[PDB]
Design a protein around this ligand. Structure first.
Ligand SMILES: Nc1nc2c(ncn2[C@@H]2O[C@H](COP(=O)(O)OP(=O)(O)OP(=O)(O)O)[C@@H](O)[C@H]2O)c(=O)[nH]1
Ligand SMILES: [Mg+2]
Ligand SMILES: [Mg+2]
Ligand SMILES: [Mg+2]
Ligand SMILES: [Mg+2]
Ligand SMILES: [Mg+2]
Ligand SMILES: [Mg+2]
Ligand SMILES: [Mg+2]
Ligand SMILES: [Mg+2]
Ligand SMILES: [Mg+2]
Ligand SMILES: [Mg+2]
Ligand SMILES: [Mg+2]
Lengths: 41, 137, 327, 95, 95, 52
RNA sequence: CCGAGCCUGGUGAUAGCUGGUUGUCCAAGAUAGAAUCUUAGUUCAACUUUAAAUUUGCCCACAGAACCCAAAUCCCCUU
RNA sequence: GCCUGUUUACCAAAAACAUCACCUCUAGCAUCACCAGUAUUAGAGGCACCGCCU
RNA sequence: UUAAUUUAUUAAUGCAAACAACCUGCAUUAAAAAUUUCGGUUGGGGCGACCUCGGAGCAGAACCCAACCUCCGAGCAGUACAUGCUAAGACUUCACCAGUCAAAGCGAACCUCAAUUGAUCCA
């Protein structure tokens, strides 16, 4: 039971992982863009 | 038990004679309401930092006043240079102002006659000292 | 045996004579909390940080000074307010939003008045503060910050990393060195249009507060005694380095007439005799009047200006003297 | 150590040795590297890998440990799934 | 009653042998003082009417102080033993 | 100064590793290799281990 | 024979300190450091001794060992 | 150092210790000391007779 | 003794226990004491300084060595988040402890420089 709970939790996290990584990288890039926009003023 | 422990603090931990304790109770009844620990701190403030001996602490009703006022005025004078704690020999470069001149007098009289400073500066110092006490605690 | 108490004894026995009735107020101000100013990082989101500080109810003493003077922004609380600025935090641009530094420490740089594109020297100023203010100013023709202490050089480097962008610091715009200012006259002469000489001093407030490495400790008696000679040598080196017609500002974090006015006068005399170079002390009385509303000044000063620490404005102590090298 | 106990007259074992070292029947003593659990955040990966290893002891160290432990710890132990069963004996050793 | 416990475990003595104690086995820690336990109640069977407790032959949980100081000494109550319970049961069923 | 913080795998595994970040800086989210999942995954700062 | 009496016992107290440590004869046998409440001591190393296994040990020809800007040393085939 | 006295038996007899006098602190009290006593009392201690000026 | 550790003992109080006091248990506060210690270098004394690590005088040229001394610095910071796992063979501060470099391989992509530190036990 514990083994399958761990496996299914890992499966759900992995399923969410690509979208989460894409969102995180997009957030970093947009923060960088906002910094450049502030520099432009 | 409250009365007995107040008296025992005044006698054993403050080394006030029996007659001195009776006179303290007669002149400053608020000491009874005042909690232990705070009273000892007030007495030791008078004794060590201010260099006031038991006869003077009793003659001038020092325990009547509040610790906040005592610390405010005394530390203000000390940092101004007017007051100076007696050395190991019990001597000071300049005679210290009288306890009556510090505590008994009103705020304006204390600031003019003794401190010779401005009420604005005194208020700033009071706020600063309150903040310092809060940080220390 | 507290070196703090030693410093108190010395400061009493000297400054009481020096200032008469002002010594009690100066003493209480020095022994009380120090009022801090927030110099907004011009490289960071300066406008946003200034708005946040104004919401925190501070005001730009530099801005109000420039208002009646007829590029720096440091916010300070009103007279009598003891409020503390919130600790500075990194901004969006990866640099700290503002620097918490003594407001009076900014006056030397403001008096130096860096013209657009001036080559600048900081002979021994490496505690941060004035150096960062100079960087935020328009000294785009390079700034040479020298100190004799690698520890303070490392601290300066860390603050520059935190505040000044690497793009600004990469070029020769900033040159940080761990050398001796006295040798600096020989190393470079008639080079810098603007020079700031913040000599080591008694640092009255720090000596009174910090026990560690207190200048008034017994073990450092020789250094304390020779301090005037070292300060004169450093100021002479800075005056030698500055270009003819160039401006220097000698700054000291102490009340000592000996360490401020006699130091500047001895530097002038030594430079005019040994090296035959004339220097004229500029008039900072207009500066005093302009900045009086925020800082309390010792009216009885011969050469230079002296911000004295008051309770209503615990920004001192800070002596600064402006000197133009006529020859 | 105690060369003759007061109750049995036997030689005693320093249990501090048992709690720290493994003896291979061949005569080698294995140990962990000191500080392998300390402040790993400031240690490089190579240093951590070096610290995480099981290490043999000197000849003099092994002699000291043999003296400090009794014969019971120097016997053949046929444990079921001992990870060190292969290491309990030497092979192709010349002198 | 004060209940104590050895700090140091005593080695097993055997079956017929007696444990051999030493200086360290005389060191104790107080596990519990029974006098500080919460009060319980004593079961009694009343023999005479008593105010605010009962009338006669009814089991009553009374404070131990009351049971041992007034009721039992004065005979107003008897212990709730099986024999007394049986006897008062016959009394009730005969009444 | 800097603080040592425990970045925890967001892949659901109990994997964790310690990093250093400025106290004043915002909490940390970081791609890191997860040996259990055998893949780079996000890690999020959970708690401050110590201050250094 | 008192800054803590005397006697007995624990007690053969402990002492990194002082002193002592008894037949004959032969043989090998000398200054490198490190840690240590450690420098009056000890543990490791080095050196020394004994026994055993094996094969290379020493001396050393060329060649070779850094820029910043003497004497020699290491390494080393032969012998 | 007030005095007469006391002291390191066995290297110090003193300016040291005590001492009347004065001063400080503590205690409102019975059947074993204090005491078969009771604040002009008892205990703890300082100093050193007395006498003066402030 | 304002050195460390204790309150075993007395005196108080507080809470339980028991029916105000006494006694017992547990706490707190004092008095009284009890056990134990008083590191190293710097002719002594005072005030100081120093004790670990890195660099120079400094071995002229493999390594190591000039202690005491003259000094100058470090008790980090920055980047990165594969700064992951493994593994031949080597170096090593003259011991050990510890500290270094690293082929190949798996898996990925296609550290920095003087010192910047601390064992066991135990949490
Ligand atoms: N590894 C490690 N052990 C510690 C540390 N602090 C204390 N210890 C352990 O505890 C011992 C020191 O005890 P204490 O000096 O009383 O420690 P403390 O933290 O000052 O105080 P307590 O918590 O009251 O023990 C060490 O020898 C270790 O066993 C620490 O920072 N690191
Ligand atoms: Mg048996
Ligand atoms: Mg005798
Ligand atoms: Mg012996
Ligand atoms: Mg021979
Ligand atoms: Mg010794
Ligand atoms: Mg006499
Ligand atoms: Mg006589
Ligand atoms: Mg006698
Ligand atoms: Mg005699
Ligand atoms: Mg005689
Ligand atoms: Mg080695």
């Amino acid at each position: 039971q514990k083994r399958r709970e761990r496996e299914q939790h890992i499966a759900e996290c992995m399923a969410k992982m690509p979208q989460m990584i894409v969102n995180w990288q997009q957030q970093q890039r947009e923060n960088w863009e906002k910094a450049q926009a502030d520099k432009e003023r | 038990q409250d009365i007995n422990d107040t008296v025992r603090l005044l006698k054993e931990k403050c080394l006030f004679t029996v007659q001195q304790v009776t006179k303290i109770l007669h002149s400053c009844p608020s000491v009874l309401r005042e909690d232990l620990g705070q009273l000892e701190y007030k007495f030791q403030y008078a004794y060590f930092r201010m260099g006031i001996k038991h006869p003077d602490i009793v003659k001038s009703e020092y325990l009547q006043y509040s610790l906040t006022k005592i610390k405010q005025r005394h530390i203000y004078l000390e940092r101004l240079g007017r007051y100076q704690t007696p050395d190991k020999k019990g001597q000071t470069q300049i005679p210290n102002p009288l306890l009556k001149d510090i505590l008994r007098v009103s705020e304006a009289e204390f600031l003019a006659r003794t401190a010779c400073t401005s009420v604005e500066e005194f208020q700033v110092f009071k706020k600063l000292l309150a903040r310092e006490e809060e940080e220390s605690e | 045996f507290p070196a703090v108490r030693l410093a108190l004894q010395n400061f009493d026995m000297t400054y009481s004579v020096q200032f008469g009735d002002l010594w009690p107020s100066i003493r209480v101000s020095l022994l009380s909390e120090q009022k801090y100013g927030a110099l907004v990082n011009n490289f960071a989101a300066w406008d946003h940080v200034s708005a946040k500080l104004e919401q925190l109810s501070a005001k730009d003493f530099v801005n109000e000074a420039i208002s009646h003077w007829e590029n720096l922004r440091c916010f300070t609380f009103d007279r009598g307010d003891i409020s503390r600025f919130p600790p500075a935090r990194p901004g969006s641009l990866g640099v700290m939003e503002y620097y918490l530094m003594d407001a009076a420490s900014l006056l030397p740089v403001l008096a130096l008045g860096l013209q657009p594109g001036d080559i600048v020297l900081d002979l021994c100023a490496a505690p941060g503060g004035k150096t960062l203010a100079l960087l935020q100013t328009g000294c785009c023709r390079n700034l040479a910050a020298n100190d004799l202490s690698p520890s303070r050089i490392a601290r300066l480097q860390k603050i520059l990393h935190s505040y000044v962008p690497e793009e600004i610091r990469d070029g020769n715009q900033v040159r940080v060195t761990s050398w001796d200012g006295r040798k600096w006259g020989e190393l470079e002469g008639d080079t810098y249009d603007r020079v700031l000489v913040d000599v080591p001093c008694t640092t009255d407030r720090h000596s009174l507060h910090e026990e560690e490495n207190n200048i008034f400790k017994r073990s450092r008696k020789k250094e304390r005694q020779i301090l005037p000679v070292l300060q004169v040598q450093l100021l002479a080196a800075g005056l030698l380095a500055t270009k003819p017609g160039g401006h220097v500002v000698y700054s000291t974090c102490s009340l000592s007439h000996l360490q401020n006015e006699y130091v500047v006068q001895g530097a002038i005399e030594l430079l005019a005799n040994q090296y035959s170079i004339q220097v004229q002390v500029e008039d900072l009385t207009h500066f005093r009047r302009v900045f009086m509303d925020t800082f309390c000044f010792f009216s009885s000063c011969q050469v230079g200006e002296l911000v004295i620490p008051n309770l209503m404005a615990n920004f001192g102590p800070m002596y600064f003297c402006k000197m133009r090298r006529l020859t | 150590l105690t060369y003759f106990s007061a109750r049995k007259g036997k030689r005693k074992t320093v249990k501090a040795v048992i709690d720290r070292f493994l003896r291979l029947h061949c005569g080698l003593w294995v140990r962990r590297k000191a500080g392998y659990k300390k402040k790993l955040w400031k240690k490089t990966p190579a240093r951590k890998k070096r610290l995480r290893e099981f290490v043999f002891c000197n000849k003099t160290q092994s002699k000291l440990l043999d003296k400090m432990t009794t014969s019971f710890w120097k016997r053949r132990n046929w444990y079921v799934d001992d990870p060190y069963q292969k290491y309990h004996d030497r092979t192709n050793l010349k002198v | 009653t004060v209940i104590v416990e050895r700090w140091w475990k005593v080695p097993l003595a055997g079956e017929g042998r007696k444990p051999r104690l030493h200086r360290r086995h005389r060191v104790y820690k107080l596990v519990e003082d029974t006098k500080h336990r919460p009060k319980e109640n004593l079961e009694l069977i009343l023999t005479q009417s008593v105010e605010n407790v009962g009338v006669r032959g009814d089991l009553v949980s009374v404070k131990k102080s009351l049971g041992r100081n007034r009721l039992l000494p004065q005979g107003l109550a008897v212990y709730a033993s099986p024999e007394n319970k049986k006897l008062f049961e016959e009394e009730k069923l005969l009444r | 100064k800097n603080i040592l913080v425990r970045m925890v795998s967001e892949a659901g595994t109990g994997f964790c590793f310690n990093t250093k970040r400025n106290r004043l800086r915002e909490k940390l989210t970081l791609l890191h290799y997860d040996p259990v999942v055998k893949q780079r995954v996000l890690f999020v700062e959970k708690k401050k281990i110590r201050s250094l």
